[PDB]
């Protein structure tokens, strides 16, 4: 999750298998023109 230049960007990746080894890039999923201020999440 990133928030830059008034845009919210979400990248995602899924895999069927403590964190595993190996390399696997994440592909872009969604961009949103929301333009708010973000400081905390849950």
């Amino acid at each position: 999750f990133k928030n830059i230049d008034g845009y919210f960007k979400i990248y995602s990746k899924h895999t069927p298998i403590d964190l595993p080894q190996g390399f696997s890039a994440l592909e872009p999923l969604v961009d949103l023109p929301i333009g708010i201020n973000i400081t905390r999440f849950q």
Partner: protein, 48 residues
């Protein structure tokens, strides 16, 4: 006026009672107003 009509107590509404028999400059006009915003913004709405 204790919530009742009377002298100096007028209901602030008035009816139109539109009829097809009025003059040309008397029938109701259907009006719309479109307002834009020319500023720096994400610019969600844009033309074809």
């Amino acid at each position: 006026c204790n919530g009742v009509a009377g002298f100096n107590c007028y209901f602030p509404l008035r009816s139109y009672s539109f009829r097809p028999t009025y003059g040309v400059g008397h029938q109701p006009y259907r009006v719309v107003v479109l307002s834009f915003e020319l500023l720096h913004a994400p610019a969600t709405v844009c033309g074809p």
